[PDB]
Design a protein around this nucleic acid. Structure first.
Ligand code: MG
Ligand code: MG
Ligand code: MG
Ligand code: MG
Ligand code: MG
Ligand code: MG
Ligand code: MG
Ligand code: MG
Ligand code: MG
Ligand code: MG
Ligand code: MG
Ligand code: MG
Ligand code: MG
Ligand code: MG
Ligand code: MG
Ligand code: MG
Ligand code: MG
Ligand code: ZN
Lengths: 219, 130, 25, 96, 220, 59, 102, 129, 87
RNA sequence: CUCUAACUAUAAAAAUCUCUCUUCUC
RNA sequence: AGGGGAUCGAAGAUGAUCAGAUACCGUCGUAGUCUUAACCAUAAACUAUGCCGACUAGGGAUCGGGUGGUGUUUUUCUUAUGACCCACUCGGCACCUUACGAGAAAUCAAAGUCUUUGGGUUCUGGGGGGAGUAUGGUCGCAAGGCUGAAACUUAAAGGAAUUG
């Protein structure tokens, strides 16, 4: 099996906790996801972070198995996880799709956005149902960042995490890209934290980018 | 009833997206640019194209707008995107290396067999009436 | 036509025929 | 599961149910009641002779405008009277 | 004739490169075919003939706008069928596009033995059925050389299939040719959808042709 | 269709043919065979697209 | 065919309810197929609030309201503009028309 | 009321197979169900089932492996003469190369091929393939 | 399937769902085939060597695809206790 | 990541209609 | 038949609207509406879905009951109740999503587990019209109810949905 180097390192679990991945799943629950653990008395179910990291490493193993990098195509329609996907497509040789999905992007072969990949990564099944339906129509696996409340129809291996955080999605994409690059071998050893930062995959509202520019242009 | 149909709008959009450094705020200079950099058959269409180009340029000067893009704007967007804060926003950089949890995720950490310095706090299971 | 009024017309025909039979019974 | 009974000892009601339902057909009802023998102009007869009474033609329906040349015949076997049709271009004059 | 057929899909690129040799590789991995020229390349002798031409009218404010529905069946009489149904303005274009769809929708069939296998399969393997609209078609194996006891359209579909002997039974409004042919198509394609004792052992899941030969796709 | 095919083989940007009359029926009917695109308004109708009208005598 | 799986009645398990009369045409209609509108309003409109306030003793009168639940028929409800015909995919929605004002 | 218990068992098996599961919980668990599932085990259409004593009719937990496609009882256990076995196989089984009409003979509950081998026939129980 | 002399007459002995043992139709345009890369001692994904699981379109449509993949990967020693055999 | 407010309100009368329906194949 | 007798209102009386209007709008208005006995047994008596039994899919609520909470306000110092909150369960009128199933579809979580056809069982239908008519029984004071054809005629009548 996987060598014990692939266990849940203290810093990586600690990061997962800090981004409040476990904190929120839902006040409700669907029996497709047993990744629940110790439903909090606040009525906010806790997510088993170890199971989440196991799903992350499984998804990394699946992605690394693809011989040609740009048949891994990652979707994000909701704002909170747009930038991260682009950033992911920067490091791993994946193809990003942000904002709208222009339906018919998988079945219709005439559209100039017609990409025929071998794997699809989805930030949220409930928002990206169109991509899931296209992948169904064209026989494509769907590694979706499913929450404990998102539906799991036409959804393959599903990373259980938060979808309302603006922190969880970016860091989940970080761990995914980091593990994929370790698997490929571009990153030499899987112990150093890969200096570039989790905040790189975080969301950036235009109002705060304007504020940051104003603070940068003050001097 | 002036609506400036497909042709003028698309031509002006392409004109901006390919020639922003040369376009100006003035209608007459942009009219001459439309004459020299593009082969508009008639001259009424040329004037309409230059007018909408000036309007779009003024809108861009006011701020960034949807649809159209050019080298300078996309470079600025990429540079703003590459912003990564030097100070850490995780790993308990705040709250004196202490992060607050409840019992349940504390037992999660315990059963995971990891040390993970925590701070317990009951969540007052009484829910807000909203 | 409505089934209601066809029914009623049949009932009135039965009216007349029943009175005639009662007269000649 | 279905309206009919299914038990191994339910032959009686199945048979009587089929026997009661058979009257819903028209061929079976005609065959058993013997309506052909009693009411039809011929009783189970493919052909029948008769005597011509008069020589009439009847107009056709709406989409077809013509007068088909028929003949009223009183049957000899029982005495019923029926109209019959002489089928061809110039056969009306042939029958007197 | 004049045909360049620049491949726009990865499967078409692999086929044009000559890397997929048999259509069984396409059928096995449930690969999606969107170019009829792939099917032309893999099956050079796909015969076809128009089942029916049907005038279909739409009532507009000015007259009645009439198109034509062509029902085309394509096959090679060796266990491969496709059923295209198209609607178009001109009858010739309707037939051409129906042939195109039929080639796109080619499907493999599982011919079997009625009993005591001696030569090549002569009939289907098991009883199969399909239902389109209200038309339910039931195909039942028959002894060797029993002909095709079927309506002329279904009979000709079996002839294009290569099934030489089969019994059939149709229930419903088999009048409508498209529904009957679609039900028969569902049944004959369901013939490979029935698990049979002789199909019980598991296989090793040979890797997909676009995984082993992904390099020859993705025109750079 | 052969005429249209030859016309677009010649390099034309669009051809159109109207055949009106008693096409295999007593009642009159008009068949349209078009390919490419044909403009209809403005002297582009006079400048680019050229037209021809002819009568054919049959039995 | 069924235009309404609920049959419009909204009864589902009663068999018979007691009818009520229409406010306009006095149509004896069942109490659930008797589309109801709770008219709560001011006894003096905004057109005369200033006039009443200036010319009233008991400074800062509460200005009491008037409440009436109107039991329309259905023909009047279509005609008196209370309820409108809807798309067959819009008939699904039973929520009130999206909070007239916030 | 529960009239034919084997019907309930086979219906539960069919429902839990069509949905893609690998297990069934049959409640009443008579002799006939045990023999039927034992025949299916002998012919491979079923996996590894289990009897759960309750002191009250027991229950059965059935393990499947997706090999089966349809069970089914012939609810009126028709007296099947040895001549009528072939007609039942033709009317029920999809092909002559496989399928089994499970029928109860005086020599026990057996598949139709085994009964034809013993040259004995009785009432018909159901069909599996 | 088998000719009497002993040669195969079937064409394309079809795949079967690795989770429900049901065959995969030729036109089953919902089914997928997952590849999971083998991992050596130092975490380097060995190329061209992996393990494949054919998930049917039916379970994917139902919503049991991820659970089935979890179980199937746990059985062949890929994920540690991600799936419990007793719910 | 925090909320429950505004409102109305018309029904005059209007009946009837004759022909005749015509192929889609590379 | 006996009692009552407000309202509203078959018949009727009119006043309007109209070409006519003994119809719709309006005003009066008997029988009736309300009852105690005795009849009547029919309704779009509708969920147009027979009953009993099993299984199959996700999401919340709602009613009746019962379990547990180291739960919250309650106040009778604390507690016991009650009232809520959270979780579960049984039963009921129901509802949202979906097809992976069924249908000719509208649609149905049953109208599913039906050509891969059998859990038990009752009633009904065999193109439309004639016709729920006649006749013969039977019930009823009467009204009418139950049972209930044929002769003959007809190539359609009808269901759902699509475009105008
Ligand atoms: Mg005449
Ligand atoms: Mg134009
Ligand atoms: Mg113009
Ligand atoms: Mg209607
Ligand atoms: Mg209503
Ligand atoms: Mg009730
Ligand atoms: Mg009295
Ligand atoms: Mg009057
Ligand atoms: Mg008057
Ligand atoms: Mg009146
Ligand atoms: Mg009065
Ligand atoms: Mg009745
Ligand atoms: Mg009824
Ligand atoms: Mg009839
Ligand atoms: Mg009738
Ligand atoms: Mg009588
Ligand atoms: Mg209709
Ligand atoms: Zn009203």
């Amino acid at each position: 099996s996987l060598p014990s180097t692939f266990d849940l390192t203290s810093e990586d679990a600690q990061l997962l906790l800090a981004a409040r991945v476990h904190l929120g799943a839902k006040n409700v629950q669907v029996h497709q996801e047993p990744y629940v653990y110790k439903a909090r008395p606040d009525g906010v179910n806790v997510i088993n972070v170890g199971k989440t990291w196991e799903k992350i490493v499984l998804a990394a193993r699946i992605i690394a198995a693809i011989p040609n990098p740009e048949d891994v195509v990652a979707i994000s329609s909701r704002t909170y996880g747009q930038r991260a996907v682009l950033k992911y497509a920067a490091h791993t040789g994946a193809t990003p799709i942000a904002g709208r999905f222009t339906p018919g992007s998988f079945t219709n072969y005439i559209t100039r956005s017609f990409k025929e990949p071998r794997l699809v990564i989805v930030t949220d099944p409930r928002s990206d149902a169109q991509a899931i339906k296209e992948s169904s129509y064209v026989n494509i696996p769907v590694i979706a960042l499913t929450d404990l409340d998102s539906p799991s129809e036409y959804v393959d291996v599903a990373i259980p995490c938060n979808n309302r955080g603006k922190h969880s999605i970016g860091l989940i994409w970080y761990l995914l890209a980091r593990e994929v690059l370790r698997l490929r071998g571009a990153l030499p050893d899987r112990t150093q934290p890969w200096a570039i930062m989790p905040d790189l995959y975080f969301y950036r509202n235009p109002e705060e980018i304007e504020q940051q520019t104003a603070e940068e242009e003050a001097v | 009833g002036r609506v400036r149909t497909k042709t003028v709008k698309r031509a002006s959009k392409a004109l901006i997206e390919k020639y922003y450094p040369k376009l100006t705020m003035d209608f007459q200079t942009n009219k001459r640019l439309c004459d020299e950099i593009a082969t508009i058959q008639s001259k009424r269409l040329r004037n309409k194209i230059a007018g909408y180009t000036t309007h779009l340029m003024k809108r861009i000067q006011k701020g960034p707008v949807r649809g159209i893009s050019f080298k300078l704007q996309e470079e600025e967007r990429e540079r703003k995107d590459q912003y990564v804060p030097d100070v850490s926003a995780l790993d308990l950089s705040h709250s004196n290396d202490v992060l607050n949890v409840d019992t349940q995720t504390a037992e999660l950490v315990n059963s995971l067999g990891l040390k993970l310095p925590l701070s317990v706090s009951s969540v007052s299971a009484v829910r807000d009436r909203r | 036509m409505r089934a209601k009024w066809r029914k009623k017309r049949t009932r009135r025909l039965k009216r007349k025929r029943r009175k005639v039979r009662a007269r000649s019974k | 599961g279905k309206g009919k009974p299914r038990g191994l000892n339910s032959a009686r009601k199945l048979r009587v149910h089929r026997r009661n339902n058979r009257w819903a057909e028209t061929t079976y009802k005609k065959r058993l009641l013997g309506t052909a023998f009693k009411s039809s102009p011929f009783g189970g007869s493919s052909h029948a002779k008769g005597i011509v009474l008069e020589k009439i033609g009847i107009e056709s329906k709406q989409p077809n405008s013509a007068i088909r040349k028929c003949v009223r015949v009183q049957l000899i076997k029982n005495g019923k009277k029926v109209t019959a049709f002489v089928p061809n271009d110039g056969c009306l004059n042939f029958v007197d | 004739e004049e045909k360049g057929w620049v491949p726009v899909t990865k499967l078409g690129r692999l086929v044009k490169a000559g890397k997929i040799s048999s259509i069984e590789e396409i059928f096995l991995h449930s690969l999606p075919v969107k170019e009829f020229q792939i099917i032309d390349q893999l099956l050079p002798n796909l015969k076809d003939e128009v089942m029916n031409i049907k005038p279909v009218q739409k009532q507009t404010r000015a007259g009645q706008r009439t198109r034509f529905k062509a029902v085309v069946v394509v096959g090679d009489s060796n266990g491969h069928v496709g059923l295209g149904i198209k609607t178009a303005k001109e009858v010739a274009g309707a037939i051409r596009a129906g042939i195109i769809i039929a080639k796109l929708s080619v499907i493999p069939i599982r011919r079997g033995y009625w009993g005591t296998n001696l030569g090549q399969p002569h009939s289907l393997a098991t009883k199969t059925s399909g239902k389109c609209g209200s038309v339910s078609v039931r195909l039942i194996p028959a002894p060797r050389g029993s002909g095709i006891v079927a309506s002329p359209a279904v009979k000709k579909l079996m002839q294009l299939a290569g099934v030489e002997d089969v019994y059939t039974s149709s229930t419903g409004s088999t009048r409508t040719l498209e529904n009957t042919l679609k039900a028969a198509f569902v049944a004959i394609g369901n013939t490979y959808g029935f698990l049979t004792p002789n199909l019980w052992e598991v296989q090793a899941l040979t890797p997909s042709p676009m995984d082993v030969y992904a390099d020859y796709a993705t025109a750079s | 269709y052969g005429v249209v095919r030859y016309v677009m083989e010649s390099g034309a940007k669009g051809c159109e043919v109207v055949i009106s009359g008693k096409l295999r029926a007593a009642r009159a009917k008009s068949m349209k065979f078009a390919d490419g695109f044909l403009i209809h308004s403005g002297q582009p109708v006079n400048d680019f697209i050229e037209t021809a009208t002819r009568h054919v005598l049959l039995r | 065919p069924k235009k309404r799986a609920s049959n419009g009645r909204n009864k589902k398990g009663r068999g018979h309810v007691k009818p009520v009369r229409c406010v306009n045409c006095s149509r004896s209609v069942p109490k659930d197929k008797a589309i109801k509108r709770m008219a709560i309003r001011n006894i003096v409109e905004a057109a005369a609030i200033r006039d009443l306030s200036e010319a009233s003793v008991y400074a800062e009168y509460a200005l009491p309201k008037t409440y009436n639940k109107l039991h329309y028929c259905i023909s009047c409800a279509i005609h008196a503009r209370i309820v409108r015909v809807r798309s067959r995919t819009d008939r699904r929605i039973r929520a009130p028309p999206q909070r007239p004002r916030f | 009321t529960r009239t034919s218990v084997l019907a309930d068992a086979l219906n539960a098996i069919n429902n839990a197979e069509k949905t893609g599961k690998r297990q069934v919980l049959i409640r009443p668990s008579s002799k006939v169900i045990i023999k039927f599932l034992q025949v299916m085990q002998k012919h491979g259409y079923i996996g590894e089932f289990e009897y759960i004593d309750d002191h009250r009719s027991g229950k059965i937990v059935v393990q499947l492996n997706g090999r089966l496609n349809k069970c089914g009882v012939i609810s009126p256990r028709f007296n099947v003469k040895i001549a009528d076995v072939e007609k039942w196989t033709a009317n029920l089984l999809p092909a002559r190369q496989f399928g089994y009409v499970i029928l109860t003979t005086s020599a026990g509950i057996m598949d139709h091929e085994e009964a034809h081998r013993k040259h004995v026939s009785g009432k018909i129980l159901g069909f599996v393939y | 399937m088998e000719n009497d002399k002993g040669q195969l007459v079937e064409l394309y002995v079809p795949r079967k769902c690795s989770a429900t043992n049901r065959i995969i139709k030729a036109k089953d345009h919902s089914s997928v085939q997952i590849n999971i890369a083998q991992v050596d001692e130092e975490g380097r994904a060995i190329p061209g060597e992996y393990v494949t699981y054919a998930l049917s379109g039916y379970i994917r449509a139902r919503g049991e695809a991820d659970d089935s993949l979890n179980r199937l990967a746990q059985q062949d020693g890929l994920l540690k206790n991600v799936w419990s055999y007793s719910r």
